[PDB]
Design a protein around this ligand. Structure first.
Ligand SMILES: [Ca+2]
Length: 223
């Protein structure tokens, strides 16, 4: 997260870290057994870490559960990043409590101008770098379709929204991928792609979760 602030500890209880040796991508818990993330984060073996705040220290609230099943969207496209969404089934259920909680899926798509919260342990710098120990947060608005498509001519599909600031300085980055964009209590975006991070006139682009609720539900019911 560039240009954010350190979240209060355990204040984002649906945030997960995906770990294969190290943190590599975020995710969101959407029920006891299932995490959602980005398909471009795919790896064959993934440990899910719930209840985290500081990813380098054991604090005593964490639950570390291995993935049992990893399912990428069948129409994911590696070139355009369309359908950048993946589901992970945990090998046992997360135990839900004050530090570990589900986020709701969208009841509808969100209006332009809606304020959202973006979170993650990704890079915090542009002209340098530095991956943080502590979870970072960022409030940013959903941008209109026009401001998004003018930024990225020909490359925004109907499954993608822009969230962010056209003046730069504030954005998600490498290592935030797969993590949540939550707006009015509802998961509306997954961190997906961008040109760089926090550049003027190149806001982050996010998978548009309100197009995928049928796919998520059908996949959970079948697996
Ligand atoms: Ca920890």
């Amino acid at each position: 997260i560039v240009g954010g602030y350190t979240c209060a500890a355990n204040s984002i209880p649906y945030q997960v870290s995906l770990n294969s040796g190290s943190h590599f991508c975020g995710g969101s818990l959407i029920n006891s057994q299932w995490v959602v993330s980005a398909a471009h984060c795919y790896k064959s073996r993934i440990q899910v870490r719930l209840g985290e705040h500081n990813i380098d220290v054991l604090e005593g609230n964490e639950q570390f559960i291995n993935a049992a099943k990893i399912i990428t969207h069948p129409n994911f496209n590696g070139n355009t990043l369309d359908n950048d969404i993946m589901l992970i089934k945990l090998s046992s259920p997360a135990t839900l409590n004050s530090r570990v909680a589900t986020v709701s899926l969208p009841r509808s798509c969100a209006a332009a101008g809606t304020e959202c919260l973006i979170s993650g342990w990704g890079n915090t710098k542009s002209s340098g770098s530095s991956y943080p120990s502590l979870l970072q947060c960022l409030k940013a608005p959903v941008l209109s379709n026009s401001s998004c498509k003018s930024s990225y001519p020909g490359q925004i599909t109907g499954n993608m929204i822009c969230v962010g600031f056209l003046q730069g300085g504030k954005d998600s980055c490498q290592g935030d991928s797969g993590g949540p964009v939550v707006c009015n209590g509802q998961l509306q975006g997954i961190v997906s792609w961008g040109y760089g991070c926090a550049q003027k006139n190149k806001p982050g682009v996010y998978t548009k979760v309100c197009n995928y609720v049928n796919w998520i539900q059908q996949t959970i019911a079948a697996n």
